[PDB]
Amino acid sequence: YIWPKGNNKVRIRVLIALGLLISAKILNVQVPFFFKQTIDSMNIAWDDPTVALPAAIGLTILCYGVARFGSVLFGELRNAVFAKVAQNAIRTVSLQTFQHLMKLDLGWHLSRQTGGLTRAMDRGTKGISQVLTAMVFHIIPISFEISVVCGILTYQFGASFAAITFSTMLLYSIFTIKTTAWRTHFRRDANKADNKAASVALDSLINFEAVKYFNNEKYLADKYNGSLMNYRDSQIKVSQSLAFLNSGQNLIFTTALTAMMYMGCTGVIGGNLTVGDLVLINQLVFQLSVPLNFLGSVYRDLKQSLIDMETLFKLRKNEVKIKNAERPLMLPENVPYDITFENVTFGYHPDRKILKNASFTIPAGWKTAIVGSSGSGKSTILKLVFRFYDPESGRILINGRDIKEYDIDALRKVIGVVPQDTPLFNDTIWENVKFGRIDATDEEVITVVEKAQLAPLIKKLPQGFDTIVGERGLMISGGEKQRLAIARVLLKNARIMFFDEATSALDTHTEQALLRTIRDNFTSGSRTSVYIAHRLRTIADADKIIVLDNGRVREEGKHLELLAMPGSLYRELWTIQEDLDHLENELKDQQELWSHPQ
Amino acid sequence: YIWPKGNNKVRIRVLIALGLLISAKILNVQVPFFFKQTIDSMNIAWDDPTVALPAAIGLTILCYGVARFGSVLFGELRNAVFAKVAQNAIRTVSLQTFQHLMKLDLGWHLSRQTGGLTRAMDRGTKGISQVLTAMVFHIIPISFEISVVCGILTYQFGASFAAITFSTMLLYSIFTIKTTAWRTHFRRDANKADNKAASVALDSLINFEAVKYFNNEKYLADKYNGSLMNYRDSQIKVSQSLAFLNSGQNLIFTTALTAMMYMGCTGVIGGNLTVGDLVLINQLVFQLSVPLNFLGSVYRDLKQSLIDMETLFKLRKNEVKIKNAERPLMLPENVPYDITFENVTFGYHPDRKILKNASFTIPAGWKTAIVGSSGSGKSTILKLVFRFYDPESGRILINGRDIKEYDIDALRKVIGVVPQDTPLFNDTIWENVKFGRIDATDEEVITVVEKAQLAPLIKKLPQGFDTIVGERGLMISGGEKQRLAIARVLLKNARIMFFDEATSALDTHTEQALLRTIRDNFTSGSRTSVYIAHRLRTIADADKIIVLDNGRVREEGKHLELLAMPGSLYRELWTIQEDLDHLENELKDQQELWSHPQ
C-alpha cells in the first residue's frame, strides 16, 4: 500500500503540491473578506457625485479579483504539479508488474486466464488515479477549507454559525452518500435491460433468416419493445432519482444559507455585525458546496479502487518456482552440446506421470528425432530441456552437468525453437523476423528471410516488410508462419536446436516444401538438432531416432535399422502412418471429383 | 429533425418542460434581488438593539431561500420531465429501426457487418440523448438566462454592464471551444500509447513462451516502458493543459466581475446605485458561470452526435429490393401446393450465373429430391422459392401463380425449413422450440419435442426445459440442433417443407438417426417436401429426383430408374459418393489406431 516515499527525493514536489494546496484555499476564504470590505467601504457619504474612486478601495476590489483568480490558479497548479507524481507512480508500477509477470514460471501462466491479468494490471492502475485523486483533489482541500471556514466563522461570528456549518456538511455527507448508494442499485438495473434489449436486437440480426423462416418479426419486434420499455422505465428512475439528489442537496444548503442570513441579520440589529457580514457568512459557506458535488459519486469508487489496487499488488506477491542455485554455472564455451536424461520422471499434475523414468541421450552434432504415437510424452522433452519445468524424479544433464546447476538464462540462450504453431506479435513482419535477435544488422534480417524462402510473402504483400500481422492484423498462411520461425531461429543462431512438430501445416504440399528449406538451413553444421515429431516420414534421415511409448523409451536406432528390427514398434507406426497418408490422399482426390461440375 | 412534437399529446410534457425551464431561470434571477433587499432593508437605524426582526424582511429572506431552492427544483423537475420525452424518442427510433432492418433483403444483411449495425443503432441512440440533453439542459437555459440577465442589467443598470456580460460569454465560449480543440489532440495521444502499451503487455502474456524461447524480456520490458513513458508524458500534458482551461475560464469571469464591481461602485458615487446593487450585479452575472463549465465539454459531442445520429437514420433510408406488388395475392386455400421453375436463370453478381435456364416441377404431395455435385445450383432453390432473392430471368410459380404476385408474408408462411445449420436464440430451449409457432399451447410444444426425439436432450440438460442454450449459454450438438429444427417446423406446420442439407451432421451415426425421425414425421401427408441433398443415399425413397449440374437440369426420375438408365449422371454421382463414404469411414477406423498408445 502507498509507499511513494523512500529515496529519490526529487518527489519533494509533493510538498509543493501540498503547499500549493494550502495557498489556494487560504486565497479562497480570503475572497469574501474583500467583498465585505468593498461593500462597507462604499456605505459612506458621497456628497460629491463627480469624485473619483478612492484607489484605497479600488485596490481592495483588485485584491478580490486577484485572490479569486489566485484560488483557482493555485489549485489548478496543485493538480498539474501532482499529476507528475501520479502518472509516474503508475509508470513505475506498470513496469515492475510487467517484469515480474515474466519472471514467473510457465505453469503459472497456464493456470492464470490472461484476460484476468490484462484487466488486473490495467484496472489496477486506474484504481490508483482514483485513490490519490480522491485524497488530494477532493478529501484534503474540502477538509482544510471546512477547518479554516469553520475556524474563521467561530472567531468572527461565533460557534452559533460554526456549529451549523459543520453540521450542514455532515448532513450533506451522510445524505449524498446514503442517497447515491441507494441509486447505484438503479443504474445496475437500468443497463441490465439495455443489455437484454441489445441481444434481442443482435439475435434478430444474426438469425435474420431464422426469423424470416418462421412467422415472428412482429414477435421479436415487441419482444424488443418490451426490453426497450423496461429500459425506459429504468432510465426514468435514474433521471428522477437524480433530481431528488440534486434537489435534496440544494435544500440542505439553501436552508443553511437562509437560516444564517437570518442569524446574521439579528447581529446587525445588535450592532455586532456589519452589513458586509451578511455577504461574508453567505459567500463564505457557499464556497464549500462547489467541491462537495464531486466527492459524492466517490465513496464506492474508493471501495472499488481499494481492492483493484490490492489485486494488482498481489501479482508481485507470486513467487518464482524455477530458480538457479547458489554459484550457478555458464559453461562450456566452444564445444558442441549433448543432452542426456537420467531416469527422468515427470508430469504436470501428480496423478498423471507423463515421462516415466526415461533415460536416453541426444548426442552432440547429431539430428536426433524423438517420436511416438499419442501419450508418448515426446510432447514434454523441450519443456524439460528448456527448464520450463523441473522433473519430479531423475535429472537432465548437458555436457555431464545437471542443467539445474546452470544459469537458467545462460542455458536458455543456447536453445533455438521452431514451435508447432508460431506466434505473431502485433507489429511489422520485419519486426517479427527481427524478434529472433534484437542487435541484428538490417541485412542479416534480409538474408535470413531469403534463406527461409520468405521473399515471396513480402512480394505478394502490398505494404511489404512494414505490414501489420497478428491477432489484430493480416493473417498469413501456416507455411509463411513456420517459415518466419525458421528465420527467427536462424538469427538467434542457437547451438541446440528444437523442431517441435514444426510441420503440422495441415496440407501435404506445404510440409513438403517446408522440410526442404529446413534441411537446407540446418544440416549437421556442428549444431545439435532435436526433431520432435509424430509423422515419422518427416524425420527418417535422422542420425538417431528415440521412440517413446506411454512415457517410456522403447527403441533407439536409425530408420532402416529400426524398420528392419523384428517386431519393432517403429515399423508398426511407420505402417499405420503410411496407410493413413495413402488414405487421406486417396480421400482428397475424390473430394476433388465432387468439387466441381461435370 | 428529431421530432419531439407530432400527433401525440405527449407534447404537453414538452410544453411543461420548457415552462418549468422558464420558471426555473426566473426563480433564479430573483435570487440576487432578495439578497439585495435583505442588504438594503437592514442598512437602517436600529437604535434599539433588543427589537425583534421585522417580518416584512423575514419575508425577504424567506423569499431568498424559497427561490434559491425553487430554482433548482424546477430545474431538476424540468430534467426528469423531459427525460420521459427523450427516453421515449429513443425507444421509438430503436423499434422502427429494428422493424425496418428486417424488411431489408438477404443480400443486404450479408454485406453489412452485423456488429457495425449494432454499434450504429447504439451510438445513434446515445447520439440523441446528447443532442437533446445539450439543447434542453444547457444551450437553451443558458441563453435564456443570458437574455434575462442582459435584460435586467440594461433596465436597472444600463447597457454599460450588458455590453460586458454578453461579451464575457462571447469571449468565454470562443475561448473554451477554441482551447479544448487544442487539447483533445493530447488525450487522443494519451490513449493512443495506452493502446500500444496494451498490446505489448498482452503480447508478452499470450506469447510468453515465444519471448522466453528467445532472448528478449528486457527487450519487451522497455518496448513497454517507451509506450508507458509516452503515456505518462502525454497524460501530464493533459493535466497541465487542463489547468490552463480552468484558469483561462476563471480569468474571463473574474475580470468580468471585477470590472463590474468597479463600474458598480462608480454608480454608487453618482447616487444611482445602492450598496445592495453591488451584490445584485455581481451575483446575477455570476449565476451564469455555474452551468458554463458543462457547456464546454459539449460542442465536440454535438458534432459527433450529429453524424452518429445521421448514420443511424440512413438505416431507414435503405430501400426494400424484394417488395410485394400493388394488390398482392394470398391464395390457394385448401389445396396441396406445387412449385414449378420456368426458364429460371439466377445468381449473385450478374456475371456469375448459378442457376442457368433451369425448369422443372416439384409436384404436390410428393417427396422431391434435388441433388447434384458442386456448382449444381441446388443451393439456390430454397432461396428462390422463399423469395429471399428474385431470379434474373425466368419465373417461379406455386400452383400456376408467379410467387412475385403473392403477399411475401403469406408466401413464406406456408414454407417450413429445416436448414443445414440450425441457430440458437439466447433464451431457453423451450423458447427455441416454441419459436416455430408462437401461439402454440404448452402441450403442443411437448408433443413436438417428443416427436422430434428431443426428450433425451432436455433430460440430459440440468435446468430441464428452462435451461439456457445459445452462443452465450450451453452449446448443444449438431445432432440436437437439427433435432430442434424438426421440432420447430412441426409447430409451424407449413404445407411446403424444405430440408436444405439437413443432415450434414459431421458424424455417421447421427445422420442416420435423424433421417429416421424425419421419415417418421414427414411422410407424404399431402405435404410437398423438397429435399436438397448431396448424399444421394439419403433420398433414394424420393418420389422424384431432380439432378442438376452446373446450374442446369440434367436428369429426372426415381432412384432405381435413374441408376439403371445408361450413361446417366445419377449413377456417376452415386458412384463417387459411395467411394467417398467408403474412404472417410475407412479413414476413421485407421485414425482411431493412432489416437491411443500401443
UniProtKB/Swiss-Prot annotation, chains A, B:
Pfam families recorded: ABC_membrane, ABC_tran
Q: Which InterPro entries match?
A: AAA+_ATPase (IPR003593), ABC1_TM_dom (IPR011527), ABC1_TM_sf (IPR036640), ABC_transporter-like_ATP-bd (IPR003439), ABC_transporter-like_CS (IPR017871), P-loop_NTPase (IPR027417), Type_1_exporter (IPR039421)
The EC number of this protein is: 7.-.-.-
**Which sequence ranges are listed under topological domain Mitochondrial matrix?**
83-131, 178-243, 300-593
GO biological process: what's one of them?
Answer: mitochondrial transmembrane transport
Tell me the null mutant phenotype. Answer: Impairs cytosolic iron-sulfur (Fe-S) cluster assembly and decreases cytosolic tRNA thiolation.
Q: Name one GO molecular function term.
A: ATP binding
Lineage top rank: taxon:
Eukaryota
For the ligand (ATP), the binding residues are Y348, G372, S373, S374, G375, S376, G377, K378, S379, T380, I381, L382, K383
Task: Report domain ABC transmembrane type-1 positions.
Answer: 14-304
Q: Please state the protein's primary subcellular location.
A: mitochondrion
- PROSITE patterns for the chain: ABC_TM1F (PS50929), ABC_TRANSPORTER_1 (PS00211), ABC_TRANSPORTER_2 (PS50893)
Q: State if Membrane is listed as a keyword.
A: yes
SMART domains membership? AAA
Subcellular localization: Mitochondrion inner membrane
Q: Name one GO cellular component term.
A: mitochondrion
Q: Where does glutathione bind?
A: R183, T184, H185, F186, R187, N246, S247, G248, Q249, G296
Please tell me, according to the UniProt entry, what happens when changing R119Q: Decreases ATP hydrolysis. Decreases transporter activity
Q: How does it sit in the membrane?
A: Multi-pass membrane protein
The effect annotated for K378M is:
Loss of function; significant decrease in ATP-binding; no homodimerization
Oligomer status and interactors:
Homodimer.
Q: What else is known?
A: Present with 3250 molecules/cell in log phase SD medium.
Q: What is this protein called?
A: Iron-sulfur clusters transporter ATM1, mitochondrial
Q: What is the lineage of its organism?
A: Eukaryota, Fungi, Dikarya, Ascomycota, Saccharomycotina
- Encoding gene, per UniProt annotation: ATM1
